[PDB]
Amino acid sequence: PGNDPQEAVPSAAGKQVDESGTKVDEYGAKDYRLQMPLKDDHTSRPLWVAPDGHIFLEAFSPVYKYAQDFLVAIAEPVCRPTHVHEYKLTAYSLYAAVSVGLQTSDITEYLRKLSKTGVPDGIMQFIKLCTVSYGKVKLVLKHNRYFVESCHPDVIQHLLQDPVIRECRMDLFDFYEQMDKDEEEEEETQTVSFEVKQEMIEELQKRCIHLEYPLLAEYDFRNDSVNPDINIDLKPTAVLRPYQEKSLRKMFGNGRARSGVIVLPCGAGKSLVGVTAACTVRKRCLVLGNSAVSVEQWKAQFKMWSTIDDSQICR
Amino acid sequence: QENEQRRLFIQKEEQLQQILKRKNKQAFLDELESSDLPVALLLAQHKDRSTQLEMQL
């Protein structure tokens, strides 16, 4: 219970999907995917927006338009089959709460701007901003500072609901120490961060945070300052490769507080980046192996690309 | 006298900037609570978000 964010939308509004008759919002597309291709370029081609199921990728004359968006349009898509220089199908899911450096209306504009006003059914519309971007920093005072957002227009519903549920509130040797605290700036703009309600109330709060129409992003401020201890990490000449160099760069494009979940293909640097996350982050980490089968393996490359082993090993 | 007066003037300015910052945002906290700003979502909460820097300045 209390585990309900926005499930994947399309369930209805369609009957015998051969919409040779209706295709009404696709007729908005099929107007401009067809009115536009006359003089040797298409300037059209809406990714073949289909209301139910998913939509496609053009990817056959991408040039710059959809070849840039061979990747970038795929944020909420997943591109489930792969092909030759032709169309490419996908699916659709939860992947807007990952795409939180952008507004659901901002993509909707470019969802239209890709589609040459190939208009949504609305199915996506009633599923665009169901979860407004919102983070949960874990700042220096031992639990969390009640961060909201770069943008203000969300506390206006929140503080009119949340506190009426649950409130919130030598020289040169030390000169640089406040120069670090000087770097503790506005968190890109305004932050709007509040004070911990006694560390035992967030569980009571999180279940009601999502309860209106928001969703929360748990972070990990464990790198600049940390009050408990730090283990000895040491990356002994572990030269690695740009598939996983991009990975932690996606885990850290911001500051030192954001969690992460990354998919690799099989046989990839699985026991590398977590071992890289074991050492760079400066935490005291944990692996949850699938079986002891995993457990022997994952320490072994940890025994390889970390010299952290002086009975410092916990299987 | 002077340096002790100087370091206390440093000490109070430490005490000046700290609890100012601690209260004006706590003022900015309850600025929203029990009132949805004067006439807009943003208005006096910008107004208060601009008045508090010249107080330190």
Curated annotation (Swiss-Prot), chain A:
Protein name (database record): General transcription and DNA repair factor IIH helicase/translocase subunit XPB
Post-translational modification: Dephosphorylation reactivates the 5'-excision step. Phosphorylation has no effect on transcription or the 3'-5' helicase activity.
Quaternary structure note: Component of the 7-subunit TFIIH core complex composed of XPB/ERCC3, XPD/ERCC2, GTF2H1, GTF2H2, GTF2H3, GTF2H4 and GTF2H5, which is active in NER. The core complex associates with the 3-subunit CDK-activating kinase (CAK) module composed of CCNH/cyclin H, CDK7 and MNAT1 to form the 10-subunit holoenzyme (holo-TFIIH) active in transcription. Interacts with PUF60. Interacts with ATF7IP. Interacts with KAT2A; leading to KAT2A recruitment to promoters and acetylation of histones.
Protein's organism: Homo sapiens (Human)
Portion of the full-length sequence here: 30 to 391 of 782
More about this protein: The TFIIH core complex from patient XP11BE (a patient with XP/CS who has a C-terminal splice-site frameshift from residue 741 in this protein) reconstitutes in vitro transcription about 30% less well than wild-type but does not restore NER in vitro or in vivo. The XP11BE TFIIH complex has all the subunits in the same stoichiometry as wild-type. Purified mutant protein has very weak 3'-5' helicase and ATPase activities. In another paper the mutant protein has wild-type 3'-5' helicase activity. The mutation is recessive to wild-type. Conventional DNA helicases unwind DNA by binding to a ssDNA overhang of dsDNA and then translocating on this strand with cycles of ATP binding and hydrolysis to 'unzip' the dsDNA. XPB/ERCC3 is believed to be an unconventional DNA helicase principally because it translocates in a 3'-5' direction along dsDNA instead of ssDNA, thus it is referred to as a DNA translocase.
Binding positions (ATP): 264-271
Disease linked to the protein: Xeroderma pigmentosum complementation group B: An autosomal recessive pigmentary skin disorder characterized by solar hypersensitivity of the skin, high predisposition for developing cancers on areas exposed to sunlight and, in some cases, neurological abnormalities. The skin develops marked freckling and other pigmentation abnormalities. Some XP-B patients present features of Cockayne syndrome, including cachectic dwarfism, pigmentary retinopathy, ataxia, decreased nerve conduction velocities.
Protein family (similarity comment): Belongs to the helicase family. RAD25/XPB subfamily.
Subcellular location per the Swiss-Prot or TrEMBL entry: Nucleus
Consequence of changing residue 90 to P: In TTD2; mild; wild-type dual incision, opening around damaged DNA and transcription by TFIIH
Swiss-Prot record, chain B:
Paired cysteines (S-S): none
Tissue specificity remark: Highest levels in colon and testis. Moderate levels are present thymus, prostate, ovary, and small intestine. The lowest levels are found in spleen and leukocytes.
Subcellular location: Nucleus
Subunit structure: Associates primarily with CDK7 and cyclin H to form the CAK complex. CAK can further associate with the core-TFIIH to form the TFIIH basal transcription factor.
Task of the protein: Stabilizes the cyclin H-CDK7 complex to form a functional CDK-activating kinase (CAK) enzymatic complex. CAK activates the cyclin-associated kinases CDK1, CDK2, CDK4 and CDK6 by threonine phosphorylation. CAK complexed to the core-TFIIH basal transcription factor activates RNA polymerase II by serine phosphorylation of the repetitive C-terminal domain (CTD) of its large subunit (POLR2A), allowing its escape from the promoter and elongation of the transcripts. Involved in cell cycle control and in RNA transcription by RNA polymerase II.
Name of the featured protein: CDK-activating kinase assembly factor MAT1
